[PDB]
Amino acid sequence: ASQPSSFHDFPDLGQEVALNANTKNQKIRWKNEVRIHSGSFQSQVELSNDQEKAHLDIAGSLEGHLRFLKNIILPVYDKSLWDFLKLDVTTSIGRRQHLRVSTAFVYTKNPNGYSFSIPVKVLADKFIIPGLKLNDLNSVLVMPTFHVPFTDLQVPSCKLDFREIQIYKKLRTSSFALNLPTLPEVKFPEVDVLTKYSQPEDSLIPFFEITVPESQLTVSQFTLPKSVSDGIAALDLNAVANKIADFELPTIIVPEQTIEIPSIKFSVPAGIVIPSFQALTARFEVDS
Numbered sequence: 001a002s003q004p005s006s007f008h009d010f011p012d013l014g015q016e017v018a019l020n021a022n023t024k025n026q027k028i029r030w031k032n033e034v035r036i037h038s039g040s041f042q043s044q045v046e047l048s049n050d051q052e053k054a055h056l057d058i059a060g061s062l063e064g065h066l067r068f069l070k071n072i073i074l075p076v077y078d079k080s081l082w083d084f085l086k087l088d089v090t091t092s093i094g095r096r097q098h099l100r101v102s103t104a105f106v107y108t109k110n111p112n113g114y115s116f117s118i119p120v121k122v123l124a125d126k127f128i129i130p131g132l133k134l135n136d137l138n139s140v141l142v143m144p145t146f147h148v149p150f151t152d153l154q155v156p157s158c159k160l161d162f163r164e165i166q167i168y169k170k171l172r173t174s175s176f177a178l179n180l181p182t183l184p185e186v187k188f189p190e191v192d193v194l195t196k197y198s199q200p201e202d203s204l205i206p207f208f209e210i211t212v213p214e215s216q217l218t219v220s221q222f223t224l225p226k227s228v229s230d231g232i233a234a235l236d237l238n239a240v241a242n243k244i245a246d247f248e249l250p251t252i253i254v255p256e257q258t259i260e261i262p263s264i265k266f267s268v269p270a271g272i273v274i275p276s277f278q279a280l281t282a283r284f285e286v287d288s
Contacts, residue, residue, distance in 0.1 A: 008037045025050050025202035038065035038096075051111035051204040062099040070094025100287035109275030111204045117271030120197055122169075127197060127208070129165040137162055152176035167208075170194040177218075181231045184254070185220035197270060206270040215261040224252030 002013040012035040020027050026049045034041040040063045048055040071094045073080045082091035090097065121128040139162060146155040154174035159166060170192050177187035191213060199206045226249070227236045238248040 004035070009035075011036050022202035023200070024204060039063055051109075051202075053109060054107045056103075056105040058103045060099075060101045064097050064099075066097040067094030070097075100285075102283070102285045102287070104281075104283040106281045106283075108278035108280070110278065111273070111275070113204075113273050113275035115206075115271055115273040117206055120270065122197055125169050127167040127169060127195070128161075129167070131163075131165045133163040135163075139163055167195060169196075177220075180220075181229050182223050183220075183230055184222045184257070186259075187218040187220065189216065189218070191215045200267075203267075204273045204275070206273075207267040208270050210266040210268070212261075212264050214263045217259045217261065219257040219259060221253060221255045221257075224254060225249040226251040226253075 002011055004010045004012040014033050016029070016031045018027075018029040026047070028045075028047040030043075030045040032041075032043045042061045044057075044059045046055060046057040070081060070091050074084055077084055082088055085091060089095075119130055121130070141160040141162075143155075143158045143160065145157045147153075148155070152174060153176045154172075156168075156172050158168060171194075173191045173193065175188055175190045178185045193210070193212050195208055195210045197206070198209050225237045227234065227238070229235070241247055241249050
């Protein structure tokens with residue numbers, strides 16, 4: 001943001017930059033504009049990329065008061081500029097001269113194009129992908145639920161398929177917490193980690209999206225400069241202070257604190273897409 005002023009109309013400027021990224025949906029817009037004295041300049045660059053189509057567009061506009069230049073004569077030809085050229089408009093007198101250049105690159109693609117997709121069978125609680133059915137190893141393995149020592153985390157039971165590939169849509173995590181004597185004890189509520197088979201809008205690639213839903217964890221309260229124990233020893237800080245100066249510390253209590261776990265999504269390809277050629281076009285124009 002600039003302030004033009006006297007002495008040949010000081011610069012007037014401005015600049016717009018837009019970036020928005022959604023993986024395969026990448027759109028970039030840039031623009032500059034310049035005004036000074038009796039001339040101005042404006043540049044535009046656009047890059048649009050998406051699943052369907054790609055646009056690359058650049059346009060350059062120039063303006064300049066080159067009237068005087070047009071007011072020229074040719075003694076070698078003994079002819080004037082406008083006369084010799086036989087052009088009057090903007091040449092006989094000379095005018096505010098513009099230069100306009102446009103470049104347009106455009107290509108057509110199919111979002112689904114030529115795509116190889118893994119075979120997926122989806123059920124309410126599981127996904128089944130029929131991979132190679134090699135008979136060399138054991139067909140199945142069953143994993144019983146396990147209690148992790150010193151905690152309340154329960155590992156959900158699972159069945160592992162070797163001939164096919166069996167995934168369980170949602171896995172359940174039991175709650176657990178830390179047991180401490182007056183220290184901040186973090187208590188973990190249950191969270192269900194899921195996997196969804198999706199075809200994103202911003203991305204042409206089919207995916208299995210492993211999603212961990214948000215989780216709120218309860219940190220237990222704790223006492224501070226009143227009397228502190230951590231399971232190894234207990235110390236009365238007020239007693240310590242009274243031992244030295246007969247003055248006891250104010251009591252500090254930190255209440256329970258909730259800590260938020262932002263949701264996270266992991267995408268693994270569920271197939272590839274090769275956009276099929278439909279048309280390629282390029283246009284170049286010079287305008288004087």
